[PDB]
């Protein structure tokens, strides 16, 4: 008897949904977690002039390692051993 | 007509030996059979997932039954066993419910006493002794 015109959750006329107690409690829980995040972000340790250059050496050496790998990309070696072990496929007993 | 296929019988036989126990033309006609063995295998994987879920639901139902036979409710039993630090899972809890009713009655009595101790602490709201079975064993 009761039809929502078209699709239920899109359009001008939508099927109504109502907020439940557990949904409200879930949102309140996430809000509390974020208020605590606001507090722990509100207290900083250092300032910008104090942190201006404290990790430049480590960042530079990490990028130098990345450069070293990207430069060291290169084909691998080949072996007389490997070719002559492919010779072994005809190794009979007697 | 060089390079013809000669083991098509064996490929068809693989699909049909997986399709043998079906009903209708889909146990012997290769096209209808191969359209159904695929669905059987996909159902097998998704039913591994459904199997784990259904076994957990069955254990929960049996624990609810036995606890209600002891007058205790399932959330009370589970939460108070957790508070008493007895970490028996739902499988062995249902197993003890079915086969070992005296041990299950002991567990239900422990959970009910822990619930009563929690109620007493909540109503006291002060610094009374914590309770004999409400003591927390600490590890370090």
């Amino acid at each position: 008897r009761g039809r929502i015109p078209g699709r239920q959750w899109i359009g001008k006329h939508r099927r109504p949904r109502f907020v439940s107690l557990r949904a409200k409690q879930n949102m309140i829980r996430r809000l509390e977690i974020e208020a605590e995040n606001h507090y722990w972000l509100s207290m900083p340790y250092m300032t910008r002039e104090q942190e201006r250059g404290h990790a430049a050496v480590r960042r530079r050496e990490a990028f130098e390692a990345i450069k070293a790998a990207a430069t060291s990309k290169f084909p691998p070696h080949r072996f007389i051993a490997d070719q002559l072990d492919h010779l072994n496929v005809t190794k009979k007993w007697s | 007509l060089r390079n013809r296929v000669t083991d098509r019988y064996f490929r068809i036989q693989e699909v049909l030996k997986h399709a043998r126990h079906f009903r209708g033309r889909k146990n012997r006609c290769y096209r209808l059979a191969v359209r159904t063995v695929i669905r059987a295998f996909v159902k097998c994987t998704k039913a591994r997932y459904l199997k784990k879920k259904n076994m957990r639901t069955l254990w929960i139902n049996r624990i609810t039954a036995a606890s209600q036979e002891h007058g205790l409710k399932y959330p009370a039993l589970i939460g108070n066993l957790v508070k008493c630090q007895v970490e028996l899972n739902r499988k062995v809890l249902a197993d003890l419910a079915i086969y070992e009713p005296k041990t299950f009655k002991s567990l239900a009595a422990l959970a009910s006493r822990r619930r009563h101790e929690g109620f007493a602490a909540a109503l006291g709201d002060g610094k009374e002794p914590e309770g004999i079975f409400s003591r927390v064993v600490q590890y370090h």
Partner: protein, 120 residues
């Protein structure tokens, strides 16, 4: 139009009642953040996804240490709705070389340097 959000310094100024609600000393601030992602980056903007990847919180419920410095704080301020932030407490100090293989983080956010698996 939906854009990025500029968040006030007024909500990031703390207050005394906030201090006793979440006990934390304004002088002598805590040194390290324990950051843990508790929300998906799906149905979220690409910049938030990128900043999650930068901070290293791709796996949910996997805690990560970060510096309590203003740049890291700015990144966490952008992505603050997908994470939980705790102070890293050290009851018996920083780990040393002889106790580095017996550590545990614990749910209280206290990195103990000695772990026995024995009752107290």
């Amino acid at each position: 139009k939906f854009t990025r959000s500029r968040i006030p310094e007024k909500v990031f100024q703390a207050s005394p009642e906030d201090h006793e609600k979440y006990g934390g000393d304004p002088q002598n601030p805590h040194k390290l953040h324990i950051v843990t992602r508790i929300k998906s980056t799906r149905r979220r903007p690409y910049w938030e996804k990128d900043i999650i990847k930068m901070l290293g919180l791709e796996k949910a419920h996997t805690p990560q240490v970060h510096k309590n410095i203003p740049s890291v704080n700015a990144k966490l301020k952008v992505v603050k709705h997908l994470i939980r932030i705790k102070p890293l407490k050290l009851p018996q100090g920083l780990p040393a070389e002889e106790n580095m293989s017996n550590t545990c983080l614990k749910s209280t956010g206290e990195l103990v340097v000695q772990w026995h698996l024995k009752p107290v």
